[PDB]
Amino acid sequence: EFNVVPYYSWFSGITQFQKGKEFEFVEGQGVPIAPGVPATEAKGYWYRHNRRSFKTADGQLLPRWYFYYLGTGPHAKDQYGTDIDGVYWVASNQADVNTPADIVDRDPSSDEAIPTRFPPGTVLPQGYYIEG
Numbered sequence: 001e002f003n004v005v006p007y008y009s010w011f012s013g014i015t016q017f018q019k020g021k022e023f024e025f026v027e028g029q030g031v032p033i034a035p036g037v038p039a040t041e042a043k044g045y046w047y048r049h050n051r052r053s054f055k056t057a058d059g060q061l062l063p064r065w066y067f068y069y070l071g072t073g074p075h076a077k078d079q080y081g082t083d084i085d086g087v088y089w090v091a092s093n094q095a096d097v098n099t100p101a102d103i104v105d106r107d108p109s110s111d112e113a114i115p116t117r118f119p120p121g122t123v124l125p126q127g128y129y130i131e132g
């Protein structure tokens with residue numbers, strides 16, 4: 001979990017389960033589906049949450065990525081496509097990534113997270129499990 005309240009994603013996360021696998025999408029893909037969001041607004045980034053486990057006397061928590069619309073979240077000020085560790089930029093081919101998405105943040109208990117879903121044809125990154 002988080003010990004500093006996070007910016008809340010509209011969407012469920014995507015969790016790595018196989019080490020060694022890269023988090024990626026084909027250009028033009030990787031924006032999760034939300035009812036009524038026009039394709040011109042489908043732009044943003046996946047943000048990596050590095051997780052850390054406590055030591056036991058048993059025997060390791062892999063990252064989980066969350067989506068933020070362009071101009072929101074923890075990297076709200078960074079330019080689209082800029083090489084930044086833990087940030088993976090995604091956008092519909094219909095989006096102009098020079099402008100922030102006209103999309104209001106989520107929460108409080110106005111709205112639960114939308115289960116992450118992608119349109120038919122989307123190449124899913126192997127080794128990752130989409131929450132929900």
Ligand SMILES: Nc1nc2c(ncn2[C@@H]2O[C@H](COP(=O)(O)O)[C@@H](O)[C@H]2O)c(=O)[nH]1
Pocket residue numbers: 001002006007008009010011012013014049064066112113114131132
């Ligand atoms: N605790 C926590 N919840 C978040 C965060 N980002 C937004 N959320 C919500 O937590 C859920 C993440 O999906 P889940 O990984 O639990 O399947 C999403 O519904 C997401 O919007 C976060 O950074 N920390």
